Design a protein around this ligand. Structure first.
Ligand code: PLP
Ligand code: PLP
Ligand code: CA
Ligand code: CA
Ligand code: CA
Ligand code: CA
Lengths: 490, 475
């Protein structure tokens, strides 16, 4: 008699959720971006124990509005300027809602053919937008792709494939040889790469974080990479894997992809390109040069759930040889066996990821591309970049401020210059002035700004592109920075 | 001038999705559970390249109805009897829809306080339903517990991150220079533990030579024999290897065997090995007192996982990992014990399920699935041509046509072929989806009760179809 998917409840709960969402988008800008709660508030307000009895879903939604929403940081706010925006769209939310309701589990093709074939089709469409070489999709090709939750999983599975190949060819006695494998990335590489290395069992003493400096705009210098890898090879270590980043998290530095692949090829090392954020911009011809050389790397990942209007989670991994991944990741449990899998004519996507089950993530990505089309997706990239250029040129027109690195995409790095005011004579002073500025913009509730460290300096990041954000939001943000800065001097 | 979240599109697209969903549940039983498509069907229906121009969302929805839905396997069907059902609820779907619209990333408490606290809260609520010791809890009623939890994507992820924590702890215990001593670490699980666990062991860098799959037999109903485990671990310790981690499963995938948790924890304690309980499916049943005995001894293990996205009415992804006494590793989940950093607000839908329906309805949800499974099991036991292969512990029944049922099921090899034929004929009708396993070297049909729209009459009707089909086979 209890039917959790009864027709009446399905329609009314979801209608109430849609009403909440409409109200939320109309009212989010008026809320403070950052909340004013203390750790532990939530269990105080909800209770410590689940209710014994049921409640009308209107009560659940009231507690959502009363206790959850006021304790949120509003990533959807047009005044959220931190990290990178989680850009979103009605088509993507619609697609994920439909996937959640059908709730298929696509470990094998047979487990739901449409879920796997649409994932393959969405990956292929995106590869076409990105102008990936045909070696990255799939009649003799060996390339292909998989949608994963995170860049970390994409790093982990390619690290495992590279690890297993290095151990096999170098003659390791089982994993006795694992302590001789070495891996390489610039010191601007996201911290999650180094964690994935540790997960896969690489020795922390052999995880090389290569220094970068202002001379290359903090991109990886391939001469410094070659020297590190050669020194390891001369010491009896096995260079195994290099991560190059296009669009680093701190300052949007860009590693030279082709030059890195050429260096790594001297050692037969795996090369993965992390383009989690800036990959989406490469659907535009004027940005596609940042991926030159990708035809010589082993794998590349990017996240539509950053800059391609697809809600979390959605990270796309492309490899030139899927057999290298399935060799490490495949299983063949009896209860999943089926004629299609046996035939070799399908790829079961459990064999391209860590886990077994998986959501129908292909649906929302296809719905975004199918509904909006390439031209609109390109104009979405370009309008975000143009807003960022407005903000950069505003920073450059005020001699109290400096733009710390060149702007490649929609992120501007800036700070209060030294010698800008009495409260910033030295550069250690200017450091504390910028920290004060940031904490003052955040208490306002009309901004969320977070910082980074660029060449030993305290720097404010301004990451443009929250989906609700328009040009006037960025200009008003500039006025608020200017205004707050003046009040700090006197 | 293009606004992807403009008010008109948000309402109209979502209302069209809700209409599709309402229609889907009302009509999914009339569709064949398994589709009649061949590999590659989709690229013959839809365009090969992404469109340059935009299209009305109605066109997108028409292609979903015309080309996607006909190629799906309907997990939501009441006649879906395979694997474990992905049980679901209006509250869970609503919660995941709201999470997608807010679209926050909770990689720190500050990156969204409500999101981190709600995940912690949802985990602490479920821990109470499971009657876990406070050593697995973050907050208690008036203070703090000594443990913690995190909401992960898969049971495989839970195994991987606990394997990594145990691996690193054993390397320090054994004075390894970095990973130099990794080749000495051994790991253990029954041969009925999911193959994804042995894959996770290889992912974490354990040596294939040291990954132990312990044989099980019918004498323990394919549960792990702790004496066999002790023998294997003692042998490795005597050879200079370091016993590092044991996985005990409550409700194995193939036949729902149950490993003896407390006995496994005691054997493993003699070597200081990490013990993880995998209760991906059966964990949800342990919110009922008549099932909670299966978790006796959990106070002595190191970690336990279960997946609400199997049997607790929460759509994928939702796997809960609990770790005891996390100091050995203000209000935060164990964010370092996941593969990635930035992922969805998974806790909202889990809280909405518990807050909207309550503990009593969740328990009756478990009990009424088990009662349907018992009905099916008694129907099978009442027909001499069939046998129930192992005792039914939860809502999965394993059965087969036995040898001697007919002239076409004379030898045990013939019964194997007849069971495969029965399965394929059932699936061809579109009125069922059944899949198989192998138990004690015999081909066995699984019957997994619990798809959310499924009622008792669906189960009785499936049994009549099984009888009808078997009769037509034996001529
Ligand atoms: C966003 C970001 C990541 C995030 O990694 P996850 O594992 O998905 O959380 C990694 N690399 C770059 C360059 C990023 O911008
Ligand atoms: C579900 C199942 C698994 C597989 O889990 P994933 O979440 O798909 O990785 C592992 N163990 C058991 C007992 C299962 O039922
Ligand atoms: Ca195969
Ligand atoms: Ca924009
Ligand atoms: Ca209190
Ligand atoms: Ca039920």
């Amino acid at each position: 008699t209890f039917q959790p998917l009864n027709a009446d409840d399905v329609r009314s709960y979801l209608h109430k959720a849609v009403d909440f969402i409409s109200d939320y988008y109309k009212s989010v800008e008026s809320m403070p971006v950052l909340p004013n709660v203390k750790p532990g508030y939530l269990q105080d307000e909800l209770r410590a124990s689940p209710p014994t009895y049921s409640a009308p879903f209107d009560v659940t939604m009231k507690e959502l509005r009363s206790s959850v929403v006021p304790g949120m940081t509003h990533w959807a706010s047009p005044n959220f300027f931190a990290f990178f925006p989680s850009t979103n769209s009605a088509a993507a939310i619609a697609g994920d809602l439909i996937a959640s309701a059908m709730n298929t589990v696509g470990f094998t093709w047979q487990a739901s053919p449409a879920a796997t074939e649409m994932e393959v089709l969405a990956l292929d469409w995106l590869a076409q937008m990105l102008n990936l070489p045909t070696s990255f999709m799939n009649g003799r090709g060996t390339g292909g792709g998989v949608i994963l939750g995170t860049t970390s999983e994409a790093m982990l599975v390619t690290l495992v494939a590279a690890r297993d190949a290095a151990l096999r060819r170098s003659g390791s006695d089982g994993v006795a040889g694992l302590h001789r494998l070495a891996v390489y990335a610039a010191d601007q590489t996201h911290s999650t790469f180094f964690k994935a290395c540790r997960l896969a069992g690489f020795d922390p003493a052999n995880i090389r974080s290569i220094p970068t400096g202002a001379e290359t705009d903090y991109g990886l210098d391939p001469a410094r990479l070659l020297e590190a890898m050669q020194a390891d090879a001369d010491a009896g270590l096995v260079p195994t894997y290099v991560c190059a980043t296009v669009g680093t998290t701190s300052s949007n530095a860009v590693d030279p992809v082709g030059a890195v692949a050429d260096v790594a090829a001297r050692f037969a090392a795996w090369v993965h390109v992390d383009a989690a954020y800036a990959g989406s911009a490469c659907i535009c011809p004027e940005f596609r040069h940042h991926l030159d050389g990708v035809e010589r790397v082993d794998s590349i990942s990017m996240s539509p759930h950053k800059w391609l209007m697809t809600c979390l989670d959605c990270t796309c991994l492309y490899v030139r040889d899927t057999h290298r991944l399935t060799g490490s990741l495949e299983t063949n449990p009896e209860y999943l066996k089926n004629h299609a899998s046996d035939s070799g004519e399908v790829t079961d996507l459990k064999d391209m990821q860590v886990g077994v089950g998986r959501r129908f993530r292909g649906l929302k990505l296809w719905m975004v591309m199918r509904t909006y089309g390439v031209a609109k997706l390109q104009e979405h990239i370009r309008s975000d970049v143009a807003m960022a250029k407005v903000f950069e040129d505003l920073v450059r027109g005020d001699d109290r401020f400096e733009v710390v690195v060149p702007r490649n995409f929609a992120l501007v790095c800036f700070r209060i210059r030294a010698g800008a005011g009495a409260a910033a004579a030295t550069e250690e002073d200017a450091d504390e002035a910028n920290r004060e500025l940031m904490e003052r913009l955040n208490k306002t509730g009309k901004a969320y700004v977070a910082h980074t460290v660029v060449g030993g300096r305290f720097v404010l990041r301004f990451a443009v592109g929250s989906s609700l954000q328009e040009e006037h939001h960025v200009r008003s943000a500039w006025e608020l920075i200017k205004k707050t800065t003046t009040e700090m001097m006197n």
